[PDB]
């Protein structure tokens, strides 16, 4: 038996590791043993931990799997392979090895970057797709982003992260301030993140290669964009897509651009939420997901 | 007589200060006493010093005035007023007290941001206008800027600079690294800047309020942008305009968008030059200005 | 439902955030659900927390809302808008969004600076006004302040705070010493502030932009003064005004100068109190407010 | 013979020390040996060195003595005695020991605070008096000073310096930043002070008891004010008084207020000068002094 | 009602502050409400806290008032006035404001410096006087002090403290070492001071102006001596005076020299005690004071 | 021949070392090869270097030997033996090994402490004795030294140095400040010590065991005193003694008390000099020594 550990708080959820062609991946699994499976993907600068408030609310009805993608949380941080097709194929191999054959997929922020090529490459495993307050490189994320005061703070980090070496130079010694700004400035209510939450995100941020790996997603975005444009030309996604917005989120209109990549788009807006919907309005989000994942 | 000081290197040029409504401005003046006047404006993260290699080349024929704008170099750094109309009016006042009634105007980078409303507001004062490798807020600077790796590094700083407090936090203790990145990464040949050149820019960067004032221009960009849009609607620019591009500059096409704002646009591209045309190709730029300023 | 959090100490009071035209504001609300409403404003270098000892004494009978103004406590710190007309308009928008249409207003220190243009601009929303130990820019705060050693310490900070860049330079690394001096030297009994109290004020003083925002109120005092003198010429305040001074406070006579801006001015002096009346004599002040707010 | 040292730059001027009732005082003396004597007094945060540009211009005609007052430059720093009557009496004793019985007196800044009670107590020794850009405590210096941003930076330091212990706490580790602000922000042209000039003022500023003694003059101001009114009520000054203003100086009108303390007041304004007239416009000032000291 | 706080350890004693002509003074009061009053004064480097072990032992019989003198403990630290006649007058004003008209006075170390001019100036208010291990400047304190190694350590700090600026320079960064030496080296048993006791003395030693004000008493000693010689020429003290020695104290003979200044001198020596009698032998000292103040 | 080095500035003087019963002593020798010999002794906190300005003035006529005593300058610092009889014996052994049998002796400060038992023990070897501004332990140095603020700064260090361990603790890291105070505060003109002079004394002060050995002289003063009382009881010094005072020196009357220890005493006062006569008035001192040392 492989070693696993029960979460000290999420009763019934276990921390596991699995090594997938040399890449060790951390994931948390639990929930209803006989239920349909939900797979949850998080983004920057977070990890599986972002779903920690939604997971126990859905556990009564669903089987729940929340992995740390390569370069996230406690998973390994390879040197290359942060184009989203490679990340999705690695996720597919992790799920295959855990005998997760078909599931609902909900993905937030950069996690949604991974979810689009995943759904496009393995449509047979994704029964329904929910994308939360995020653009998709090359198909819905615009090639240019606003610079006018009032909106720039929402997207300034995109272009910054693509610059070589300078982000590492400026963030050094200022890691907690950088994280603190990202999390608390984009929430509707900053108290949605405790000091203990920031501590946890700082742990995986400053841990060997965390910053390098986080930036690598942005630095591979032009390759990921070209991949998605090739995939989009094969046809729109056929499975139902839920475009989940937040009334104070980063994306003004989620459903509109997604109608160009999916045949059936259902729109939902979460009230009283900034960008971090799974942590800010877990109940409201759980409700939409449970209702859509049917 | 006010105190003035001869430049230890630019023979015939003198450093002066004048106080304009409580605001002291540093400027360097020289050249042919009987000549037609050229006024030279520089941008971020520089000062009058950016023109130090062009100024002696034109001194034989023209009378040259190179001021530090408010918030630049050795000029004072007021707390507000960095919308470009207020900066332009402050500049106009300085020129009046120096009995500069009519002149040619060449402006680089954020200096060019000031040059557009100045020429729009004081049409008679500006004989001819040269704008060098810069967008003008709200009229030639697009409302959205590239995020593709490969072009995003040219413009990422716009949105970053608009964010409150985070830039001061990240730049602290890394002022030289930040400045060095701007100068050497955006030049075609980084040896266009000696270590002594960087030392001089660092001196004015780190002096009392240097960073604050530099950031203040970007943080006021929505207001300048609206101001420029308002004057935009009042007619095209009166006087002839030379749109100077650099083949490796920040702006792909300078002449094109300026045709939307001026009656007579003359196009010029400086070869083998990055963003810092006055320092990278002084001789070629001086010739273009010498021929256009007739 | 928005996320809110009960105060662990002020039982029956909840911490909330609301976003007003891009600016997120923190506020604490509680008290008797069917009572009349009192709105409480604090000044420098404090926050809503300065009312923490008065709030439970009035909660039996009044509805109580204590917001952090823009630039205070846990509210956002915009880059501009610290002229008190803009701040009062922002506060008005915040109150409207909570359907607080008519209320009693009590304001201390810089809080009173915002309270005056608020009462002048929205007289129908302010049933009665209480101003605590403060002058009002341009109408009751004198244009010159004392320099004699026995009095100069009460007002020296005013002019200091208007200087660009030097205050940030001198306070850096001495934030606690600066805070400690203000709170404990201006109270009649320095033990009115515990170490945990200073810790709390130090937390919000040192958070992103805390010093910048606190200083911005003083740096905009000339615009705030010009605004108030225009409002004063439209007529004096129409609602009853309570001028509360402290026998050891900063202002020798509150009622006197205020008779020129309000029609019915009632005077009260709290004994055994320095400048921080709500923290130094909370019952005495609660009695005066309870009696006046009828 | 006592040890003395020739100034390496001021030809004909010697640095001397003399002990005056336990207090060692440094002074620079030179100029025409049989000429009439000018005594030069400087203020905060300077020393005899502030007169270094005027002294050689007048040395042809006058014997010139430039002392460091107690608490200034290289003179001792007693613990008490910074009320200006005691400082003036100490200066008288120094001059008596150097056989200087009658002289012209020119005094700048806090030096002028010493000059007024000196002139009032020893009228037979002061042939004529020149006061430069300074108010005199209790007589021409107002009891309250302006606070509008625009003129507040000119006088903010007065009240600050009267505060016990906080100025030492805030200035510690920022001595050069504090000095640099005072000298360069208050001059019409900041290049009137070289780096080596700031270095010299920093040397005497950071030397044992330097800050304590400089601040002590402001802290004794109320005693100094009371002394001066006792003298000012005993009759106007008898000798001619030259009130020297600067067009960009700290004080709007010098001659006006001085007409109440002296029978014969002559007005002079030095053009293109900030507060530091002896360093900023030495030739113009020397001409005014030579012309008046007649 | 003024704010007061019960001492967490001393039953029946309250911490208070009162403002006396601008100077806020901290004091601890308690004991038998209708009992006769004892006022207790401490010296360097201590505070009211030095009496904390004697105070409960006398509280059954006497009303007890233990103030921090100006410059001590949590009392304000004015800039000047540490000549002991001025301190005594400040103490007198504090006692009058508390309606303490006639009382017993027991004073230790520099506190005894204050008590002698107090009793000479206000003989009707001092029923009886106890002076503990201290000389009186100019009157019992010798003009020269020992240099022999075996005893010079008892008094070396006297002359050291009068030196300007050098003490601050040497003690900086060594405050705890300096205090520890004073308290523990002069006690007969160094365990008379716990680490928590040293912590408390360090807190008030290192607070704003603590070292400055502590030294000021010694720096004004020649003014205090001249004052005491004038007072002594008016006649010897008429009330009974108790001269309290310690067998290992700083002063070899208390009673001898005091017979020249007081008419009735009672001698007492406390055994097994160093200089800090109130803390080292509280019960023996309390019995002597009780027997003498009855 | 032993290695010796010529002094780089004092031409004709050589630096030498010799070992005396395990203790290396550094000394400088030069002057008239066939002249009579003067041995020169310096004190705290100096070395032979204190005589560098006197040595060349006498070198034309006299043979001059200026040693570093044990614990001074570049000589060894033994662990014990700082009673002045042991030091004098160590000096005697050095002079014998260099075949200096009879000579004039001039001694300053602690050097004079050594000169007295030397002259008392080896009278045939000392032709004449000159003592410069110093008392002699137990015979001329009083057992108590004055503590008026006006005079305590001259002698406070005696008692301080006798305290175990605290001087090392307080002086650590402040060696230059401590030296600077000693040298420049006791000179009539502090410019008698250059920064290079202070550098030289700081070098030997800070050299390993420098502070320990310097303090050891003061810590042994009581043994030295008892030795000196025994020797004096054997008779007055029989050779002529010159008592050299300074008009601003440490010792008010030198010749007076010396009349009790020597048979014939000549008095001389050097004008315009603080304590450090050899450095402050080298020419005046050279003339007096010259006239007496015949």
Author numbering:
A (entry chain J), B (entry chain I), C (entry chain G), D (entry chain H), E (entry chain F), F (entry chain E): 16 to 309
Show passages lifted from the paper:
Cfl1 and Cfl2 also appear to utilize a Cif-like His-Tyr epoxide ring-opening pair instead of the classical Tyr-Tyr pair. While Cif and aCif exist as constitutive dimers, our hydrodynamic and structural studies revealed that Cfl1 and Cfl2 exist as octamers and decamers, respectively, by forming rings of dimers.
In contrast, Cfl2 shows very low activity against a diverse set of epoxides. The H-G-W-P sequence of Cfl1 follows the canonical H-G-X-P motif, whereas Cfl2 substitutes the histidine with an alanine (A-G-F-P). Each assembly is formed by a ring of dimers: a tetrameric ring of dimers in the case of Cfl1, and a pentameric ring in the case of Cfl2. In Cif, the equivalent residue His128 does not form a hydrogen bond with the catalytic water. Given this striking difference, we also analyzed the corresponding Cif and aCif dimer interfaces. We found that the surface area of the canonical dimer interface of Cfl2 is very similar to those of Cif and aCif, albeit with a modestly higher contribution from hydrophobic residues; the Cfl1 dimer interface is markedly smaller than all of the others. Similarly, in Cfl2, the N-terminus of monomer 1 makes several electrostatic interactions with monomer 3 and a hydrophobic interaction between Pro17 and Tyr287 (cluster 1). As a result, within the Cfl1 ring, the three dominant modes include interdimer flexion, seen in the form of new areas of deformation which correspond to its oligomer interfaces that are lacking from the ex circulum Cfl1 dimer (bottom row). The lack of substantial Cfl2 activity raises the possibility that it may function as a non-catalytic pseudoenzyme in vivo. However, this is not the case with Cfl2, which maintains the epoxide hydrolase motifs in its amino acid sequence and 3-dimensional arrangement of its catalytic residues.
